[PDB]
């Protein structure tokens, strides 16, 4: 939903471009192999450089939206496998801390 007046704080009238930004964007396809580890994407990072959505995200300080996420994978009735598709809010990544755990390294 759009931000209700009771929760809003910024006072300028927002721009709600609608159809030019609320539409389906398809990203680069990944290749599933027998030894694949798994993948992740960050939102809205995925689209900040794509289409009119990207432009609005770059021209404005403030942004807000929901998302319809659709993951597709076809295989035959003789293939097998199971992907867990999940949305993790605030997905903060960590490092292996140098392997030993002594290094306070950070994800680039």
Among residues 87 and 96, whose Cβ is nearest to Cl ion? Answer: 96
**Minimum CB–partner distance for residue 36 and Cl ion (Å):** 18
CA–CA distance, 1 with 10 (Å, rounded to integer): 17
93 binds Cl ion (CB under 5 A): no
Q: Where do we find the tokens 């290094």?
A: 103
Give Cβ neighbours of residue 79 (< 8 Å, ≥ 6 apart).
none
Q: What is the size of the binding site for Cl ion (CB under 5 A)?
A: 2
Which of 17, 95, 98, 103 is the binder for Cl ion (CB under 5 A)?
95
Among residues 20 and 95, whose Cβ is nearest to Cl ion? Answer: 95
**Minimum CB–partner distance for residue 96 and Cl ion (Å):** 4
96 binds Cl ion (CB under 5 A): yes
Give Cβ neighbours of residue 81 (< 8 Å, ≥ 6 apart).
32, 75
Give Cβ neighbours of residue 62 (< 8 Å, ≥ 6 apart).
10, 14
92 binds Cl ion (CB under 5 A): no
Footprint of Cl ion on residues 22-81 (CB under 5 A)? none
CA–CA distance, 19 with 7 (Å, rounded to integer): 24
Interacting residues with Cl ion (CB under 5 A): 95-96
């Amino acid at each position: 939903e759009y931000c209700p007046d009771t929760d809003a704080t910024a006072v300028d009238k927002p721009t709600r471009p609608d159809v030019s930004v609320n539409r389906f964007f398809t990203l680069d396809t990944k290749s599933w192999a027998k030894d694949s580890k798994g993948w992740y994407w960050k939102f809205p990072d995925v689209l900040t450089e794509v289409g009119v959505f990207g432009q609005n995200a770059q021209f404005h300080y403030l942004y807000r939206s929901g998302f319809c996420v659709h993951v597709q994978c076809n295989a035959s009735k003789f293939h097998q496998g199971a992907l867990l598709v999940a949305v993790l809010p605030e997905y903060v990544l960590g490092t292996i801390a140098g392997g030993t755990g002594n290094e306070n390294s950070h994800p680039p």
